[PDB]
Design a protein around this ligand. Sequence first.
Ligand SMILES: [Mn+2]
Ligand SMILES: [Mn+2]
Ligand SMILES: [Mn+2]
Lengths: 48, 48
Amino acid sequence: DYLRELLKLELQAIKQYREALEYVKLPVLAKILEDEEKHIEWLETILG
Amino acid sequence: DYLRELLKLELQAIKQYREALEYVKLPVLAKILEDEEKHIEWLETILG
Ligand SMILES: [Mn+2]
Ligand SMILES: [Mn+2]
Ligand SMILES: [Mn+2]
């Protein structure tokens, strides 16, 4: 369950960073989004 | 305000990931934690 909570937080965050990126095109937001996409891939892998 | 909000989501993730690491000790969690700490630094730069 702690694992599903983490995936929920990453999906939660990916949605907000996308909205931020839409509002202002600061490249560092895209860079963070690439990291978060990796985090989601890793948590999905831990969940099998 | 929207940036402060992303910063808070990173603080929340750092707390949860640290707790998860404390319990299952998977290396990949430590990698994610390193990234989130970087995200915090980047956002703090943008902010005050
Ligand atoms: Mn929003
Ligand atoms: Mn993350
Ligand atoms: Mn992050």
